[PDB]
Write a protein that binds this DNA or RNA. Structure first.
Ligand code: ADP
Ligand code: MG
Ligand code: MG
Ligand code: MG
Ligand code: MG
Ligand code: MG
Lengths: 16, 1541
RNA sequence: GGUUCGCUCCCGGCGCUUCACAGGCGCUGGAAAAUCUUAACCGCCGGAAGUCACUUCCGCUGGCUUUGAUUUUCCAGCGUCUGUCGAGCGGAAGGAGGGACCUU
């Protein structure tokens, strides 16, 4: 428990 | 604005439909529903310009918020030609009267404002529903429950059901919250609430395509992973906050108002502890939700908020709580930055380092947020981008603002594109990050967004409704959407073309969020389904439904005049009323609601209340509702509270506390409690404090009747009565020069005269008289000569001699004078004395028997002189002679006799070639035909002066008279010889002046005896008294260790009390207009200073509950010259004043001479002749010898001569005027200026001060009924007088006096006085801006007493030391000594300013600048460059400190020691030379004319310009400063500097 | 001892104008803070009711939005009350002196 795990920077703007 | 305002098709059809009937317009935000509202207002403006009573109507524009109300006000003002009224609560309509509403109504055609204000305006009968034409309600969807819109709608129900104004609601959303099921029922409820029919899109072709400009957004979703792990520092911070909570709960702060739960069944923590708990809970929420860096900004926000709260804390315990919170926040911040630096130690690229720490310690939600911004914006031009970010919590806005600032500064790709700003709603929070007053600003954050300065906005739900924003191209939602309306309005904010709408959610939350979004979409579509499916009806005419819907609430009450109290306003009304009632600083006045238990409901009420709840109202003793009130049985406690408040308000209105308009009454007046008692004596003289006294400067002068002293009244001797004769001694103090030989020789002759009285005179002090030859010391014998008038002819001889003196010798006689023996004023005689049996002097009977009348100076021809005997050589020495041949018939004294000299005289320098014999033949041969005794007789003769007013000091100067005066040698046979002794005539010359001086000396003796009797001062120096000679008033302008002040020394010690000298009382009585060698003007200064101090102390002691404002208001009247005039008239003293300058031959009346008794009788007995007898009619009278001697009554001719003036002036329109000009002496009338009487009272006070200390003068004030007595004790001693309490002293305990006074030891040492009661010092140092001022007063009240004490002590010191200085220079010195500037200089010189308990930026900066300047000046008073401003607070602090030093010891001697130890160099320097004020110095300059100006402030530095002249050329210098006075002073100083050059 | 000057100066008081110092107050704007309070919406947890944690009701508590009121403080401008007092000006009266003199 040291830091927040850095998420996958590649993501898509999902349409509603 | 402009004529370009042309409506769309949908707007025009909407307004067309709206004119027909009520309704609600439902259009998306940005469709211009405001514009169609403006058009509706315009369409209903047929009657706007007409007055209300004639039938004119106005329109209403209600808004849910003040800010949106202002926005709509601006919109309607710019889009219409009407003048709009903006009425909100903060504007101050809380106490506007009917006129103050009617003028606004008639001046404004359309009205805008919040709903509550218009609700109050309608319910208080300021307007009526029938007086309105159309009503506009924006955001009508808030009209649910007890919202003010629904109350205003119920106002339509209670009002007349016909002839009713139109109503329209403007909205873009209808469903508030999550009532997204069965939307048809909610829509129908909104319809019936606003009694209208909702209108929306019906033509899909034209309305939709025109509205398309308000584009729908593109709705997008961004997901982030759920965070399950919490960091170690998170648990550490949580544990620390938990133990801090434990400490806070254990911490025992002062008692606070009781706070309890919403339904009042459970108790809650006090509001102040609740606040810190709330802030820490919010910080923990930010920490858990948004990451470590977000927490590092939130801890800054907590730091600044806690610092502000500590700075505004009202109690030492609250300060300690906030200090503990602050240090815990500092520890948390230290931990957070430490945790950041652990990762920042990775690399050196500081920008990338900041970016990566933000990335690593953020939550994945904010991580996704940052990546979304980075990909969406991507170095785009800032002019294009305008986006809103929505977050739930208030502090989340600030936290995200700070984090985004840091991220932008850490991203070169994003550095210049985004300019973030954050906005929070009404619960405002501090926008600063560093400290107090980071920077003063003028534009709001929303205005910065509007102007394009800011492009990214982070805000709470505040910006969702109403507020006008530009069509944003991007909208982001951070926290999950909570309500349907929030979603709809947030998507409506993204109005521009191809705008982006983004919402954030967790991975595990996607399905629930999508379900909620689809439910919102379904409800939004169902709105249109209901609108397109409903059948057409006119105005929802189901009135039965309206009544059924509105009847659930409690029925409102309407009283007389038609005012109405709604039940839902009752709680607000009750709390407003409870705010008004007086109470202590802690005592809560809000009602203490109490819910009744089960056993109480069925006891107070029946069994019906078994289920329904009943609540009772309990109220503190300060309010009228002493009887408990029980609410009706209601199903919920909220309605029970509403009903209880409604019934309580009804009861209060029945009691008359609530007025006709259901608003509580107000206070009337406070100071009248003193005007009732202290100023009673004003009424009997035709004046009152309530009336406008200064109307046209009414009656600055008054008429008084003079009265002779008791000794001079009825003192005329009669036959057989024992009589007293006081010999009058004239002792010339001048030298025996040739010019003064005869004067000096004849004044010391034993042939003195004496005054005859039946009464016994007291001892009289030696007094000065100033002749041309020098000064005289005239004294009256203390032991009289006992004589008895055994025969009536002796009395007749005395009377005829007395009349003959004034008639022939002194020539005071006027033709209309009458010698009298029956008038009792000044009924006394003066008789000559001669040596009898050794020292037993006796009446000069031989002189009076011969000189019943002075023989006439008549001629004698040569033959007649031959028939007459030759003139004896030894019959001329010391005798009065006159030149009967010369034009001048004045008498003249023989100073030398000659037998060697002869009319055949030795020739002189101007008598050359002639003897005096031939000289008289040459000059006046027509009279001197020859000389019959040419042989052996000659005399040397001196003229006698005509002067009678011997008071002028400077007339006796010898420098000019040092030049020789030629002799006047006269032949004896040519001058008639009066056998009257010349030495007695020379003494009779001074007689009128001695008589007039003895008059007022006896008056002063009577006053001395009176004021000694009142004080019970009958000690040794007051029976065997021997008065010191009366001194000249040299200041009249005619020619380590501290020494204790003598006035206080004799106030405390009896041994130093000196007798009140008779000369001092004579001076105090004699006005400056009397032209004497003394007056009251010096005593007046000391008297006024003592009066000021005593009035201040008396008012502050008796009336401690008052503030310095009311105390000053009362004192300004108590010590006013009008009050002093009435007070002195009450003592019957003004009848004894000496203001007439004693012109004997024109204004005096001899003691034995009176006017005709008919004149006196008709003057006294006739109200029409009281003061209106003709002057010249009385002065033109002439009476015969025996008519003036014994007849008394004048002849009928002169009687009618003056009675004609009496009739024409008194018995005519001239009634009330004064015609006693130059005939004042008849009945003893005199006109004395009011200020003279006031200064007489002040001078008597000053004399008693100087002679007997301060307590005896306080007793004199009691005698003068200036200080009214009381029932418990009449009046206590001026010293040890009980003054103090909650307002002159700090009420804090000994446990916090050291908490407030950090270093009281070094102020105790510095000031030189040791306090035994630190509470006075604490209030003396407490500036009014300090937070504790609201509970424990301030220095402002104590400064009043301090100023009075310091002024009196300084005045007394400069009075007693500088004995030769007139009052003008004395007060110039005092003003220089007690100036605010010099008080500040002494305050900084002793470094007292360091201990002031104040919190104010613009005061502290001024204090620091001034102290820096004074240190640069080296404590030297400039009596400056670049307009230095004086911190007026320092002088007031010093004055209050002096007051505290006095009150601690209750001794004026120790106070004076402290004041002297402070003022010693100042006193020495200003006594050496008085620093006249710079403005005064410039104005008084005989060559330069200041001619200043009254310009504007042009910002802070208000400017003043001067116009003076310097060496015949005009110059114009400019003054700048914070205020007008400082700018003018600086300009005057600059003008002085130029003048010096 | 007295007269006289368009002569020089001075004291005090009256009338008009105006300034300074001390204690204040009111009105109008600007700024800051404290306390109470209104309404609406949503959520956490607990209890109850109809089909009984599905829907509803009640309570706690938290969050947002929000209304009105009271009090305190500072700053600026305009008026105004009282006390002390100076300066300028019409004018009257008194005094000092420097000329012109006037007696013997
Ligand atoms: N027919 C029109 N004529 C002139 N201006 C219009 C018209 N329709 C809309 N506007 C402008 O568009 C803006 C609409 O914004 P606003 O009325 O605040 O939207 P909403 O009332 O829906 O919140 C107004 O400022 C108005 O000036
Ligand atoms: Mg609008
Ligand atoms: Mg005076
Ligand atoms: Mg006075
Ligand atoms: Mg003050
Ligand atoms: Mg002061």
């Amino acid at each position: 428990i040291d830091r927040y795990e850095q998420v996958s920077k590649d993501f898509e703007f999902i349409k509603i | 604005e402009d004529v370009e305002i042309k409506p769309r098709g949908y707007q025009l059809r909407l307004v067309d439909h709206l004119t027909k009937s009520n309704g609600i317009v439902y259009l998306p935000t940005g469709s211009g529903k405001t514009f169609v509202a403006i058009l509706v207002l315009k369409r209903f403006s047929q009657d706007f310009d007409k007055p209300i009573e004639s039938g004119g109507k106005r329109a209403l524009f209600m808004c849910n918020t003040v800010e949106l109300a202002r926005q709509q006000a601006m919109a309607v003002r710019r889009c219409t030609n009407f003048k709009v009224g903006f009425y909100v609560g903060e504007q101050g309509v809380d106490d506007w009267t009917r006129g103050m509403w009617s003028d606004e109504i008639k001046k404004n055609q359309v009205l805008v404002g919040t709903a509550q204000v218009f609700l109050d305006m309608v319910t208080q009968t300021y307007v009526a529903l029938s007086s309105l034409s159309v009503v506009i309600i924006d955001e009508c969807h808030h009209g649910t429950g007890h919202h003010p819109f629904r109350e205003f709608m119920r106002l339509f129900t209670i009002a007349n059901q016909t002839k009713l104004p139109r109503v329209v609601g403007l909205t873009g959303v209808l469903i508030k919250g999550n009532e997204i099921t069965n939307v048809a029922t909610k829509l129908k409820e909104l319809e019936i609430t606003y009694r209208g029919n909702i209108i929306t899109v019906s033509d899909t072709k034209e309305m939709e395509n025109v509205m398309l400009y308000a584009t729908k957004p593109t709705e997008v979703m961004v997901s982030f992973p759920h965070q399950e792990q919490v960091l170690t520092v998170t648990r550490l911070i949580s544990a620390e906050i938990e133990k801090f909570y434990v400490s806070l709960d254990l911490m025992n702060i002062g008692v606070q108002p009781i706070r309890r739960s919403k339904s009042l069944q459970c108790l809650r923590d006090p509001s102040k502890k609740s606040f810190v708990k709330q802030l820490f809970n919010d910080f923990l929420y930010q920490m858990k939700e948004y990451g470590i860096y977000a927490a590092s900004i939130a801890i800054i926000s907590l730091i600044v908020e806690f610092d502000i709260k500590r700075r505004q804390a009202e109690t030492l315990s609250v300060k300690l709580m906030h200090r503990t919170a602050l240090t815990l926040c500092e520890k948390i911040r230290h931990l957070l930055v430490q945790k950041l630096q652990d990762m920042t130690y990775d690399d050196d690229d500081d920008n990338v380092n900041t970016e990566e720490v933000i990335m690593n310690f953020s939550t994945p939600k904010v991580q996704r947020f940052l990546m979304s911004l980075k990909v969406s914006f991507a170095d785009k031009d800032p002019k294009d981008i305008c986006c809103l970010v929505f977050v739930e919590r208030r502090y989340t806005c600030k936290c995200i603002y700070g984090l985004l600032l840091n991220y932008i500064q850490s991203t070169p790709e994003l550095r210049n594109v985004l300019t973030p700003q954050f906005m929070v709603g009404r619960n405002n929070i501090s926008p600063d990050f560093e400290s107090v007053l980071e920077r003063k600003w003028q534009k709001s954050a929303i205005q910065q967004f509007r102007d394009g300065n800011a492009n990214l906005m982070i805000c709470s739900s505040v910006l969702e409704e109403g507020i006008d924003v530009q069509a944003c191209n991007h909208v982001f939602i951070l926290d999950p959407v909570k309500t349907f309306n929030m979603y709809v309005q947030s998507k409506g904010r993204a109005r521009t073309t191809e705008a982006k709408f983004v919402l954030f959610t967790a991975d595990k939350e996607r399905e629930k969020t999508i379900q909620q979004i689809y439910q919102y979409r379904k409800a939004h579509n169902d709105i249109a389904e209901y609108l397109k499916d409903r059948v057409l009806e006119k105005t929802e005419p189901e009135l039965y439904e309206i009544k059924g819907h509105f009847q659930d609430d409690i029925d409102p009450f309407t009283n007389e005049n038609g005012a109405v109290l709604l039940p839902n306003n009752a709680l607000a009304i009750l709390h407003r009323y409870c705010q008004t009632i007086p109470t202590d600083a802690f005592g809560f006045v809000i009602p203490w609601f109490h819910v009744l238990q089960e056993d109480e409901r069925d006891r107070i009420f029946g069994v019906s209340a078994k289920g329904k709840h009943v609540i009772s109202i309990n109220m503190p003793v300060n309010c009228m509702l002493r009887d408990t009130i029980y609410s009706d049985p209601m199903d919920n406690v909220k309605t029970a509270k509403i009903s209880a408040a409604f019934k309580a308000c009804k009861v209060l209105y029945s009691l008359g506390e609530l007025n006709e308009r259901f608003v509580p009454k107000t206070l009337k007046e406070r100071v009248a409690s003193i005007a009732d008692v202290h100023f009673e004596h004003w009424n009997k003289y035709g004046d009152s404090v309530t009336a406008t006294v200064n109307k046209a400067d009414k009656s600055k002068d008054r008429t008084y009747k003079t009265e002779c002293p008791l000794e001079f009244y009825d003192a005329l001797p009669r036959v057989g009565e024992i009589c007293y004769a006081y010999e009058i001694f004239l002792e010339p103090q001048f030298e025996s020069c040739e010019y003064t030989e005869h004067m000096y020789l004849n004044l010391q002759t034993p042939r003195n005269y004496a005054i005859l009285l039946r009464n016994k005179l007291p001892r009289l002090a030696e007094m000065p008289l100033f002749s041309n030859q020098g000064k005289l010391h005239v004294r009256v014998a203390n032991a009289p000569l006992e004589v008895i008038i055994q025969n009536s002819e002796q009395l007749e001889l005395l009377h005829q001699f007395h009349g003959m003196v004034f008639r022939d010798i002194l020539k005071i006689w006027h033709p209309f004078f009458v010698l009298d023996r029956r008038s009792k004023e000044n009924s006394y005689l003066v008789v000559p004395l001669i040596l009898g049996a050794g020292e037993q002097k006796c009446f000069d009977w031989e002189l009076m028997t011969n000189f019943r009348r002075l023989p006439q100076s008549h001629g004698s021809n040569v033959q007649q002189r031959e028939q007459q005997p030759a003139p004896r050589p030894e019959d001329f020495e010391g005798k009065i002679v006159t030149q009967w041949y010369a034009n001048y018939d004045k008498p003249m004294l023989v100073t030398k006799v000659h037998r060697e000299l002869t009319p055949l005289s030795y020739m002189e320098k101007n008598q050359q070639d002639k003897t005096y014999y031939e000289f008289t033949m040459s000059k006046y041969g027509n009279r001197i035909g020859d000389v019959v005794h040419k042989d052996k007789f000659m005399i040397e003769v001196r003229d006698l002066t005509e002067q009678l007013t011997f008071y002028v000091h400077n007339r006796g100067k010898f420098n000019a008279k040092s030049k020789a005066k030629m002799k006047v040698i006269l032949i004896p046979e040519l001058c008639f010889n009066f056998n009257f002794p010349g030495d007695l005539w020379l003494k009779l010359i001074f007689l009128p002046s001695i008589l007039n001086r003895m008059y007022f000396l006896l008056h002063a003796e009577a006053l001395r005896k009176r004021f000694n009797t009142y004080l019970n001062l009958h000690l040794l120096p007051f029976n065997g008294t021997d008065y010191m000679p009366r001194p000249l008033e040299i200041d009249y302008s005619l020619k380590g260790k501290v020494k204790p002040l003598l006035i206080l020394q004799k106030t405390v010690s009896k041994e130093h009390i000196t007798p009140a000298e008779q000369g001092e009382f004579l001076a105090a009585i004699t006005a400056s207009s009397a032209a004497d060698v003394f007056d009251m003007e010096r005593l007046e200064i000391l008297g006024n200073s003592f009066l000021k101090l005593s009035a201040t102390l008396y008012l502050a002691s008796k009336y401690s509950d008052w503030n310095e404002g009311t105390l000053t208001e009362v004192k300004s009247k108590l010590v006013s010259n009008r009050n002093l005039l009435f007070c002195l008239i009450d003592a019957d003293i003004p009848k004894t004043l000496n203001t007439i300058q004693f012109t004997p031959r024109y204004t005096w009346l001899p003691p034995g001479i009176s006017l005709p008794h008919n004149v006196l009788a008709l003057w006294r007995e006739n109200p029409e002749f009281a003061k209106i007898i003709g002057p010249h009619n009385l002065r033109d009278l002439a009476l015969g010898d025996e008519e003036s001697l014994v007849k008394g009554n004048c002849s009928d001719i002169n009687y009618n001569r003056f009675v004609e003036g009496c009739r024409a002036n008194g018995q005519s329109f001239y009634a009330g005027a004064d015609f006693s000009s130059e005939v004042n002496f008849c009945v003893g009338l005199v006109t004395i200026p009011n200020k003279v009487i006031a200064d007489t009272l002040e001078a008597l006070l000053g004399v008693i001060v100087k002679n007997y200390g301060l307590q005896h003068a306080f007793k004199m004030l009691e005698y003068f009924k200036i200080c009214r007595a009381d029932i418990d004790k009449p009046l206590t001693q001026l010293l040890n007088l009980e003054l103090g309490g909650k307002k002159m002293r700090a009420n804090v305990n000994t446990t916090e006096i050291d908490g407030f006074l950090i270093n009281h030891y070094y102020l105790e040492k510095n000031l030189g006085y040791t306090f035994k009661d630190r509470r006075y010092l604490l209030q003396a140092l407490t500036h009014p801006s300090y937070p504790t001022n609201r509970i424990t007063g301030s220095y402002q009240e104590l400064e009043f007493i301090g100023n009075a004490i310091l002024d009196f002590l300084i005045s007394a010191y400069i009075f007693e030391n500088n004995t030769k200085m007139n009052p003008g220079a004395l007060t110039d010195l005092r003003s220089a000594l007690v100036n605010n500037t010099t008080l500040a200089c002494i305050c900084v010189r002793h470094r007292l300013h360091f201990f002031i308990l104040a919190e104010n930026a613009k005061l502290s900066e001024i204090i620091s600048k001034f102290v820096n300047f004074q240190e640069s000046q080296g404590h030297r008073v400039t009596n400056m460059s670049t307009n230095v401003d004086v911190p007026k607070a320092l002088g007031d602090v010093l004055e209050a400190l002096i007051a505290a030093v006095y009150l601690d010891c209750r001794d004026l001697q120790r106070t004076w020691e402290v004041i002297f130890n402070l003022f010693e160099p100042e006193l020495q320097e200003f006594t050496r030379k008085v620093p006249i004020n710079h403005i005064r110095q410039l104005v008084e300059h005989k060559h330069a004319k200041p001619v200043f100006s009254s310009p504007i402030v042009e910002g802070e530095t208000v400017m003043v310009s001067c116009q003076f002249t310097c060496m015949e050329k005009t110059i114009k210098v400019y003054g700048f400063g914070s205020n007008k006075d400082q700018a003018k002073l600086s300009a005057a100083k600059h003008a002085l500097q130029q003048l010096s050059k």
